[PDB]
């Protein structure tokens, strides 16, 4: 059927392909600026800024375009001053013609083992408020909505504004 | 007046002290489980899971308890599949009797330089929806509320539930 395993440098082309496919899936249309070079340098350079798990399918079940990777999960470690190291799930995506096979649940299982192995007190991630199916999917597994409970809002300051603060009076 | 500099292992006692002081400041009362040992191992071990900047004041301006560190900022790097490496500001705190001296603005300035230096497309962080003063403070510097714009909600799955998923059918 398929296997869930850590990504290797050779998988970066597959990951970018899936990221671009994910970007298309999304509704919040945004351009993917990442290049395979970035994924290689940032993930398999001196310091890994992200980690990926990939879902590989048997050679005789490849993608119509001849691809063995049909899914991926990107994560990294974060830190909380109160409790310490946390696991952060950035994104999770499985190709359309491969959903409903359990791949998604297997990735989640593997991420949970990573959390256990790396001594993470919990796993954080974002869910769009309008995505009720996903909200319930996670709540059914014990997830808590911290934005709803504690009022947290995600803020961002772009490079343009960062540059101003970096070089101001 | 004061200086903003990167933290060293020797500063971990000061940081935990400030974290516990921050925990008291907060209203969402929670127990600080972190120990100085954790901060040392997680920040100055083989792999740094967080980075800290500290605000040090002259020897002749120390804290009533004899402390030179009166503020800190904790950050780490994250990753976005669309744009790449990001700077994530976890927490920022300055002792009461040292606020209104510009220390806060200096830390922000230093964090911005880190973002520029490490090629981060932007800086992400959380702000409580009820903290209007902080919301405006950041908006005045170009920040965008991504929860308000894109509907993002922060979710968490505790270790108890992670363990279940890690060892289930």
Swiss-Prot record, chains A, B:
Active-site residues (renumbered): 138 (proton donor)
Pfam families linked to this entry: Acetyltransf_1
N-acetyltransferase domain ranges (all copies): 2-169
Biological processes per GO annotation: angiogenesis; polyamine biosynthetic process; putrescine catabolic process; regulation of cell population proliferation; spermidine acetylation
Subcellular localization, as worded in the UniProt entry: Cytoplasm, Cytosol
The entry's keywords: Acyltransferase, Cytoplasm, Transferase
Family annotation (CDD domains): NAT_SF
Catalytic reactions of this protein: an alkane-alpha,omega-diamine + acetyl-CoA = an N-acetylalkane-alpha,omega-diamine + CoA + H(+); spermidine + acetyl-CoA = N(1)-acetylspermidine + CoA + H(+); spermine + acetyl-CoA = N(1)-acetylspermine + CoA + H(+)
GO molecular function annotation: diamine N-acetyltransferase activity; identical protein binding; N-acetyltransferase activity; spermidine binding
Covalent S-S links between cysteines: none
Residues that hold acetyl-CoA according to the record: 92-94, 100-105, 131-134, 138-141
Subunit structure as annotated in this protein's UniProt entry: Homodimer.
Protein family (similarity comment): Belongs to the acetyltransferase family.
Protein name per UniProt: Diamine acetyltransferase 1
Chain's gene name: SAT1
């Amino acid at each position: 059927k398929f296997v869930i395993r850590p990504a290797t440098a050779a998988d970066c082309s597959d990951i970018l392909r899936l990221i671009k496919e994910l970007a298309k899936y999304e509704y919040m249309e945004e351009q993917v600026i990442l290049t395979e070079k970035d994924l290689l340098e940032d993930g398999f350079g001196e310091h890994p800024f992200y980690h990926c798990l990939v879902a590989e399918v048997p050679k005789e079940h490849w993608t119509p375009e001849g691809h063995s990777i049909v899914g991926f999960a990107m994560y990294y470690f974060t830190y909380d001053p109160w409790i310490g190291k946390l696991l952060y799930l950035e994104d999770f995506f499985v190709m359309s013609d491969y959903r409903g096979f359990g791949i998604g649940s297997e990735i989640l299982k593997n991420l949970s083992q990573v959390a256990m192995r790396c001594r993470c007190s919990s796993m954080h991630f974002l869910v769009a408020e309008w995505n009720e199916p996903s909200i319930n999917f996670y709540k059914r597994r014990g997830a808590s909505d911290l934005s709803s409970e504690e009022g947290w809002r995600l803020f961002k300051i772009d490079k343009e504004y960062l540059l101003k603060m970096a070089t101001e009076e």
